[PDB]
Structure formats: C-alpha cells, structure tokens
Amino acid sequence: SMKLDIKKTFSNRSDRVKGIDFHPTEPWVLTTLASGRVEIWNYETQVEVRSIQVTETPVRAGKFIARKNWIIVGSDDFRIRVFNYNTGEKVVDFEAHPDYIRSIAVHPTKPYVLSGSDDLTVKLWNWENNWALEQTFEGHEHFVMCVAFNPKDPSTFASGCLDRTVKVWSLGQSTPNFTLTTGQERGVNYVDYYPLPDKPYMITASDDLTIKIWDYQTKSCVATLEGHMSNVSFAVFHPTLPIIISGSEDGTLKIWNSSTYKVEKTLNVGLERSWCIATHPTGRKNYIASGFDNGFTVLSLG
C-alpha cells in the first residue's frame, strides 16, 4: 500500500541513452548516448544547456562533478574524458582501460573516480594527482558492469559483475572485503547502496529477471523482487521515498515498496528498452530520470 503522485517533468527523444545523471544545484540532467553524443538538458526550461559529439563509439558512463564544474564520461573507445560544462573545454582525455568502460563513480568528497571495465577490473583515478592511476582492483572474472561508492563509508565501494558476484572493496587493499555470490546466474548488471544510515542494504539487478536486496553485514539476501519480463538493467533505492525503482529491457519502470518488496506501480513511458537511472542527489521534487532506446524522461514523484 502506498500513495504515489508521479508527474512527467520533461521527456525528449534521442538515440539510445546509456548513462544519465542529475546536477545537484542546477536543474540539469546529463545523458550519454550510444551514438557517442552527450547532452545536458535543463528539464525545467526544456532547453539544451550544452551537447558534445564526444566520440563515434557508445558513451555508457557519465557523471557530473559539480564542485569542479565538470562532466566525466567513459566510452567504448576505452577513454575517459572530462569537459567543463560552462566553457566546453576538454579538461582531460586518456585511455583508462584496454576495453569498454561500463560504469563511472565519483567519490563524494575526495578527488577520486572509479571506472569499471570489460577488462575485468576497477581502476581508481586521482584528479588532484594529475589523474594518476592510483590502484587497479583485480578479482572479477567477467565484465565489471557497475561500480558505486558506499555513500555512508566511501572508503569502500561495490562492483557488480557478469561473473555473478558483487565484490566490496576498501581503497588501498587489493582483495575484496567480501564477495557476494548472488545466485543471479546470468550476471550482475547493477549494484546500488541504500543511502540512509538505518539499513546496511545494497541491491543488485540481473539479466535473469530478478532484483535482490542484501544486508552487507550478514551478507544475506533480504528479498528477491520478481516481475520484470526481460533483462533488468538497474534497480536503485530512492533517497527520500520508501521505494525501489527498476527498469528493464521489457520497456517498463517498476516502483516497488521498500518495506514489503511488492510492486506498487509499473510505468510504460513508451521509449522501448530502459537502460539507466538517476535520482536527484538532494531529493529535489523526488526527481528521477531514466534513459531508454528512444530517449529519456524526467519524473517528479510524491
């Protein structure tokens, strides 16, 4: 049971949206496309702030680094690129991995970036040390699809891997603090942390149609969420509302009750397969945004 008030704020068509991110203080959403293009939209005015043809290959990963006025993106050409979004200047451009970059995470306070790659590793970059490669995390046995800092202890992070595991690491140590054997036999596409201090929870999404909730102190599966009818691309906890949001190649977003783990609403936004998700970091208007085959949509909830 739950009362939801979902409003479409802004939706627009584009090539396939593989990455998406909210700016914390400007009403902006970043989209990164399979076409090599990235776009920054003001979703309140519905005007493009800035766009870049970054490369000719897909750009699967993109994040704002607001405290530097940067966007950072990673692409199938193996390269990490950083742009100032006020001038368009390309700040840095380097080969990060010898294979596809699937995911990028930005430390909340330190000048650290994590990149997850088909080269089976996560790499740690320090932009206050000339973008030095500070550490490579080895252990996974297939593509690393998703990396995410623990917002409550960002000296640790999680990596989700097609080898069917999540690994949780400590910066400066070479082996996982623990490995979760998820039982998601088609691999792990996405991993996310519950942001609030009251629960030590993470969540994983898989091609095997399931979503799983984990207690990372007991390493136990709290619940399994079933309902999607094709590959689940992502699942995340909402930063303010008691819900989980997932999206799937079945073309839907699903909103789940985070206490009962039952589905509360299924949305078909009409843009075919769903690939990526973002939630506004301060919970402004409970905004969420998802990228799809045929564009993106920004929704306000509650």
CA separation, residue 64 to residues 82, 104, 243 (Å) = 10, 11, 24
Query: What letters, b where the CB count within 10 A reaches 16 and e where it falls short, cover 264-290?
Result: bbebebebebbbbbbbbbeeebbbbbb
Cα-flanking dihedrals φ and ψ of residue 283, to 5°?
A: 75, 15
Which amino acid does the sequence have at 279?
T
C-alpha–C-alpha distance, residues 112 and 150, integer Å: 13
C-alpha–C-alpha distance, residues 205 and 231, integer Å: 9
Residue 117 near residue 76 (C-beta atoms within 8 A): no
Residue boundaries of the structural domains of the chain: 7-300
Q: Which long-range contacts (CB under 8 A, 24 or more apart) does 96-102 make?
A: 96/123, 96/125, 97/121, 97/123, 100/60, 100/76, 100/143, 101/60, 101/61, 101/74, 101/75, 101/76, 102/60, 102/61, 102/143, 102/144, 102/145, 102/146
Residue 136: alpha-carbon gap to chain centroid: 20
| CATH fold for domain 7-300 | Methylamine Dehydrogenase; Chain H (2.130.10)
C-alpha–C-alpha distance, residues 73 and 81, integer Å: 5
Tokens in use for 214?
Answer: 């984990």
Residue 37 near residue 54 (C-beta atoms within 8 A): yes
**Helix, strand, coil % (nearest 5) of the chain?**
0, 55, 45
Tokens in use for 218?
Answer: 């007991």
Write out the DSSP string of 155-183: TEEEEEETTSEEEEEETT-SS-SEEEE--
Tokens in use for 222?
Answer: 């709290």
* Residues contacting 253, CB < 8 A, separation 6+: 245, 246, 247, 266, 267, 269, 274, 290
C-alpha–C-alpha distance, residues 55 and 65, integer Å: 20
C-alpha–C-alpha distance, residues 176 and 79, integer Å: 26
Given resolution (angstroms): 1.8
Query: What determination technique applies here?
Result: X-ray
C-alpha–C-alpha distance, residues 148 and 131, integer Å: 19
Residue 100: alpha-carbon gap to chain centroid: 16
Q: Please tell me what DSSP assigns to residue 197.
A: T
Which residues on adjacent β-strands are paired with residue 37?
53
Tokens in use for 252?
Answer: 């839907």
Residue labelled with tokens 């949001």:
245
